Design a protein around this nucleic acid. Structure first.
Lengths: 106, 183, 127, 197, 156
RNA sequence: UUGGCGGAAAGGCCUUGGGUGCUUGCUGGCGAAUUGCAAUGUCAUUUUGCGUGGGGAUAAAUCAUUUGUAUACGACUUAGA
RNA sequence: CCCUGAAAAUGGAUGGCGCUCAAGCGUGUUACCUAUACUCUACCGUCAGGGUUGAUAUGAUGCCCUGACGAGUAGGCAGGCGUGGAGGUCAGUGACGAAGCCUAGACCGUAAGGUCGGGUCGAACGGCCUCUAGUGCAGAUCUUGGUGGUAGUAGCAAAUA
RNA sequence: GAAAUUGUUGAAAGGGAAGGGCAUUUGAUCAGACA
C-alpha cells in the first residue's frame, strides 16, 4: 500500500518541571488522539524513538535514534511521561515522536 | 629568522624582515592587511596609486574617530586613509622580496603576498609638558615588519579519505536484499 | 590484564572550577572555599556552582582505580618494578617522566617477561 | 493531529481563540488564522475602544519611537494577544511565532483549502445570550485601519468566484446518489452494513 | 623509591559466588496466543507481515511461518512481545510440528533439509486455509497504522 | 495538447482530445528464507558547488576628473569617447 | 455584588497577555502538578555501640558486624595538601636531557594537589621517615616593575607671511 | 624567556553585553577495554 507506519504518531512537549526548575531526565508525550488517562494506560511500557538527521554519516547512515519508553500518566490528558537511554535534547520541544507498539500485550 | 605561523612550501618561497621600523604600528597594520593575498606585481601598482589620493588603504581595526571617504567604496567601508609613511616601508620590502625571490629562481608573474604580519616593536620613550609641571609619556609605536612572497599554485586535486566501513550483520543482509533485487 | 569488581562510578566527573577563575586572569582555576559574607557560592544560593564536599567520596572499593581497574604505581627503575610482580590484576605501573630513554625500554621489557601492564608505554618512544 | 491548520476566526473571542493557537504552536502545529476582521470579544463596543484607547497612550516619553507600537489591523491585534502568551523572548519562542500567520479575509493559498473552528472559543457558546460583544471589525476601524472596506469587497467576491463552487459540488454529490442505489442492494452492499458500513 | 610502597597489599583471590536463589520457571504467556492463530509481527525484516502461530518452543520463542507460498514467511523463531495476537483462528488440525526445537536453529546460502519442511508444513496449512474466506489474501497483505488510527481503540 | 477560468500573496484550478502504462472489478501461477528472536533499518525535501551536453542574451556601477540647485567629512546633484 | 462618592504629576502594570452561564466573586466535590521535606535503596563521611591474637600473609592504630546522624558567619578542634632549607634513608632520577616554561592530551583524589603524554630547554633534582621555618594571596586608594582600553583620538591655532 | 598585552593564521559563535550552572545534541578530540 501507500502506508507503512507500526508506530503511533506523537510530540515532545517538555521537561518534569515546576514553574521555574526543570528535570531533563523525565520528558513529556502529546500521543496523537489520546485524551484521557485510560485512552493513556494502553501506551504504558511501549517504546519511543526521538528519530532524527546528522550531516556527517557514521556506522552507515546519514539516520539516528534515542531509545524511549513511555513509564506513566502525566494530569488529566494522557500527556504521559518518558525516561529515554539518553536525555531528549529542549531543541526538540515540538518535534515528532515514534510511540511504537512493542513490549506488546495484545 | 623564525617567522610567524606560515603555511606554505618554502621551496617556492621568498621572505623579508624591516625591524625596530619607526613607522607607526597601527597604520602599517592597516596597509599590510590591505595588500595581503595579493598578486605581487599588482600590489606594488596599488601602493604607488595610494602614495598619490588615487585609491585608499581601507582602516578596519584601528579606525575610530578616523574621519570618511568616496575611496571607500571598492572595500565595503566608509572609513579610509592614505598612510604615506606606512607604504613608503611595506613597498620597500616588497622590493626587497621580488629581489629575494629573483636569487632562488621564482617566476615574477605568479609571485603572490601569502603571509604578512606587523608587530608592537619596542617603544621610543620621550616626554611632554602638561599644565602644572606634570611630565607625561610621548612614546614613538614602532613596527616590526615581514612578508612571505610566494609562487601561486594550482588547486591542490583533493585526495584523503579511507572511509573505513564498520557496519552490522543486520545491515549487511539489508544491502545484500538490494543488489539481489535490482542493483 | 581484571579482578571482577563492581562498576566504577565517579560521582562528579567535572572539574571543581574556582569561583571567578573565567572573569580573572589573577584568579587561578585551582579550588577555593569562598569566605565572603556576601558570597553567592558560600551562601549556596540556586542557579551557581557546586562546592566540593565529602558527599561526592568515590565507593571505597573502586578508589584510585585507571577505569582498566588497576591502581597505578610510580616506577623509576627496574628494583622498583619488582614489588608488583604478584598483584598484576590489582596494580599497574607508570614509568617516571624524569626516565633516560635507554632505561625505559629496560623497565618496558622487564614489564612483560612478568604480565604487568604499564599506563605510559609511549614512554618517549623514538617513533 | 496534521501539518497545517486553517482556522476561520469569525465568531471567535480573541481572547480565547487567542490561546489554543499558542498553545498548539509550542507543540509544532503550524497554524493560519484567517479571516479575522470578524473576531469578537466580551464587552459592549463602546469600551474596548476604551481598552484600546490606552495600550495607545503608553509610549516612551523620550522617544515615541522606539516604544510600544500600536498596531491597528485586526490581524496584528489578534496576533499580539496571541502572542503575549508565547514567551518570545527566547528561541523556542520565536520558532513559535513563525509557525503562525494571520490575515483578515481569506486571501488565496487558503480560500481554496479547508478551514475549521475552535468551538471552545466561539461566541456563540460562551456566551450567554444578552451580553453585548464586539467585532474587531469595527474596533480596527476606529483606531484607524485604512483598510476594512477593501476587505469587505474582496469578501463579497470570494463569497462566490465561491457558492458557485458549491451549487456545483452539490449537483454532483447528488449523482452519485441517484446512481448509487442502482448498484448497492447489490451483494456487496448488505454484508457490508453487517460489519458496519 | 618516586614512590614508597604499602604495608597492605590486597588479595589476588577472586570469589566463590554466593549460592543462589533464582530457579528458571516456565513462561506463562498472555492468553490470546493459541496455536492456530493470525499474528502480526511488529518488527524485524517482516514488519506487519501477518503470520501463523504453530508451536511454542523452550527458549519462551514462537515458531511461526506464514504459508511460504502466500508471503516470504519461512519457519522462524519470533518473540512474543514483538507480536500482536489477533482473534483469527486456522485449525492446526493436521500439523507435524514435533520435529521443531531450539537445536533446529543452531548460526553454527540456504540449508535442502529446511526447504522440504516448508513444503510438507505449508501443504497442511494451505488446505486449512483455502477452508475460510479471502483469508489467503488477509495473510498476504501487510498490516498498517492509517489516518485516524487508534490502537488503544482497534480491537485486534 | 485543445480551450477556458483566477491578481487579495494571482504562481494555482477545471476541461476537451488523443498517445501510453498499472489495474486488487473477478480467477490463477511462479518468487520472497540466512536482515538468523527486536534494533529508524535509511525510500523525504533544504541550499550550494564542480565538470559533461540541449536553447538563449552579448552590461553596468565605483574611483579619478568635473558641476553647485549640495555639502563638516561621506552623501546629494549634474557633466563628460 | 455592582455602581457614585474616587483628583498628581515620564508610559504601565490582578506579575503579563488576556478573561464576562469567566480565566470574576462566594462555596462544595474529586482528579491532577511539584521542594534539598517524608518513605525505600545505593554510595560518602562522622559518631555510637559491638565481634575478632590461634599460630601461620600481607595493617591490632588492623580486619569486620550493626545502628543513627550530616545547614552554618563569628568562633573553636581535628585530619590532610603544598613551599624554602636541615638529619636519616631509596648504593633513587639525570647531558641516552635535571630544573623551569607551554600544552580546550590522558589518569588519581570530595578537595587542597598529585602523576604522566607531546613540545620547549641545558644542569642539576625527587620520594619516604623526621626536624625546621623570613612557609601558601585577588583585594590593603597595598609596594616595585610592566602593559592595556581610552586612541591614531585630544590635540600640535598668541607674536601680520 | 612566564603573564598581562599585541600581530598573522586556523576553527567557531554573535538582533542592546559577556561569562557561569544542570541536562542532552551536534562538531572536533582522546582513554581504556575486548583478546
Amino acid at each position: 500500500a501507500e502506508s507503512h507506519r507500526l508506530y503511533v504518531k506523537g510530540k515532545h512537549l517538555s521537561y518534569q518541571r515546576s514553574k521555574r526548575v526543570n528535570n531533563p531526565n523525565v520528558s513529556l508525550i502529546k500521543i496523537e488522539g489520546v485524551a484521557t488517562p485510560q485512552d493513556a494506560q494502553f501506551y504504558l511500557g511501549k517504546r519511543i524513538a526521538y528519530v532524527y538527521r546528522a550531516s556527517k554519516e557514521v556506522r552507515g547512515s546519514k539516520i539516528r535514534v534515542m531509545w524511549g519508553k513511555v513509564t506513566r500518566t502525566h494530569g488529566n490528558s494522557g500527556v504521559v511521561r518518558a525516561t529515554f537511554r539518553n536525555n531528549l535534547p529542549a531543541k526538540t520541544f515540538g518535534a515528532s515522536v515514534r510511540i511504537f507498539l512493542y513490549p506488546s500485550n495484545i | 629568522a623564525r617567522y610567524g605561523a606560515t603555511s606554505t612550501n618554502p621551496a617556492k618561497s621568498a621572505s623579508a624582515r624591516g625591524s625596530y621600523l619607526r613607522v607607526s604600528f597601527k597604520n602599517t597594520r592597516e596597509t599590510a592587511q590591505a595588500i595581503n593575498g595579493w598578486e605581487l606585481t599588482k600590489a606594488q601598482k596599488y601602493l604607488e596609486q595610494v602614495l598619490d589620493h588615487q585609491r585608499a588603504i581601507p582602516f578596519r581595526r584601528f579606525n575610530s574617530s578616523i574621519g570618511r571617504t568616496a575611496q571607500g567604496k571598492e572595500f565595503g567601508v566608509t572609513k579610509a586613509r592614505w598612510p604615506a609613511k606606512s607604504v613608503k616601508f611595506v613597498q620597500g620590502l616588497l622590493q626587497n622580496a621580488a629581489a629575494n625571490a629573483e636569487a632562488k629562481g621564482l617566476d615574477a608573474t605568479k609571485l603572490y603576498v601569502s603571509h604578512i604580519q606587523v608587530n608592537q616593536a619596542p617603544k621610543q620613550r620621550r616626554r611632554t609638558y602638561r599644565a602644572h609641571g606634570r611630565i607625561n609619556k610621548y612614546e614613538s609605536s614602532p613596527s616590526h615588519i615581514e612578508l612571505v612572497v610566494t609562487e601561486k599554485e594550482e588547486a591542490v586535486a583533493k585526495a584523503a579519505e579511507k572511509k573505513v566501513v564498520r557496519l552490522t550483520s543486520r545491515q549487511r543482509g539489508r544491502i545484500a536484499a538490494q543488489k539481489r533485487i535490482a542493483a | 590484564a581484571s579482578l571482577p569488581h563492581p562498576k566504577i562510578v565517579k560521582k562528579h566527573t567535572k572539574k571543581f572550577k574556582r569561583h571567578h577563575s573565567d572573569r580573572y586572569h589573577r584568579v587561578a582555576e585551582n579550588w577555593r572555599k569562598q569566605k565572603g559574607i556576601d558570597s553567592v557560592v558560600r551562601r549556596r544560593f540556586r542557579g551557581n556552582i557546586s562546592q566540593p564536599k565529602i558527599g561526592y567520596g568515590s565507593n571505597k572499593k573502586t578508589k584510585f582505580l585507571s577505569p582498566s581497574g588497576h591502581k597505578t604505581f610510580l616506577v623509576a627503575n627496574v628494583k622498583d618494578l619488582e614489588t608488583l610482580t604478584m598483584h598484576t590484576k590489582t596494580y599497574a605501573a607508570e614509568i617516571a617522566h624524569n626516565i633516560s630513554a635507554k632505561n625505559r625500554v629496560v623497565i618496558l621489557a622487564r614489564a612483560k617477561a612478568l604480565g604487568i601492564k604499564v599506563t605510559n608505554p609511549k614512554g618517549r618512544l623514538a617513533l | 493531529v496534521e501539518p497545517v491548520v486553517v482556522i476561520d476566526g469569525k465568531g471567535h473571542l480573541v481572547g480565547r481563540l487567542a490561546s489554543v493557537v499558542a498553545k498548539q504552536l509550542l507543540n509544532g502545529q503550524k497554524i493560519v488564522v484567517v479571516r479575522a476582521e470578524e473576531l469578537n470579544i466580551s464587552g459592549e463596543f463602546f469600551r474596548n475602544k476604551l481598552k484600546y484607547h490606552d495600550f495607545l497612550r503608553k509610549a516612551t516619553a523620550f522617544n515615541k519611537t522606539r516604544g510600544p507600537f500600536h498596531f491597528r489591523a485586526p490581524s496584528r491585534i489578534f496576533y499580539k494577544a496571541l502572542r503575549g502568551m508565547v514567551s518570545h523572548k527566547t528561541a523556542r519562542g520565536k520558532a513559535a511565532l513563525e509557525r503562525l500567520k494571520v490575515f483578515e479575509g481569506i486571501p488565496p493559498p487558503y480560500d481554496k483549502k479547508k478551514r475549521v473552528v475552535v468551538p471552545q472559543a466561539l461566541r456563540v457558546l460562551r456566551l450567554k445570550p444578552g451580553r453585548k460583544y464586539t467585532t474587531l471589525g469595527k474596533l480596527s476601524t476606529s483606531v484607524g485601519w485604512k483598510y476594512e472596506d477593501v476587505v469587505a469587497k474582496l469578501e463579497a467576491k470570494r463569497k462566490v468566484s465561491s457558492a458557485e463552487y458549491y451549487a456545483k459540488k452539490r449537483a454532483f454529490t447528488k449523482k452519485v446518489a441517484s446512481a448509487n442505489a442502482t448498484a448497492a442492494e447489490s451483494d456487496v452492499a448488505k454484508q457490508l452494513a453487517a460489519l458496519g458500513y | 623509591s618516586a614512590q614508597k610502597a604499602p604495608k597492605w597489599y590486597p588479595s589476588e583471590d577472586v570469589a566463590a559466588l554466593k549460592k543462589t536463589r533464582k530457579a528458571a520457571r516456565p513462561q506463562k504467556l498472555r492468553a490470546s496466543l493459541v496455536p492456530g492463530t493470525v499474528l502480526i509481527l511488529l518488527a524485524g525484516r517482516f514488519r506487519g507481515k501477518r503470520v501463523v502461530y504453530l508451536k511454542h518452543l523452550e527458549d519462551n520463542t514462537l515458531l511461526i511461518s506464514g504459508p511460504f507460498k502466500v508471503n516470504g514467511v519461512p519457519l522462524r523463531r519470533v518473540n512474543a512481545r514483538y507480536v500482536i495476537a489477533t482473534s483469527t483462528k486456522v485449525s492446526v488440525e493436521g500439523v507435524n510440528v514435533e520435529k521443531f526445537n531450539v537445536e533446529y536453529f543452531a548460526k553454527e546460502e540456504i540449508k535442502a533439509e529446511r526447504v522440504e519442511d516448508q513444503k510438507v508444513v505449508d501443504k497442511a496449512l494451505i488446505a486449512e486455509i483455502k477452508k475460510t474466506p479471502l483469508l489467503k489474501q488477509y495473510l498476504s497483505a501487510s498490516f498498517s497504522l492509517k489516518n485516524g488510527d487508534k490502537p488503544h481503540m482497534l480491537k485486534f
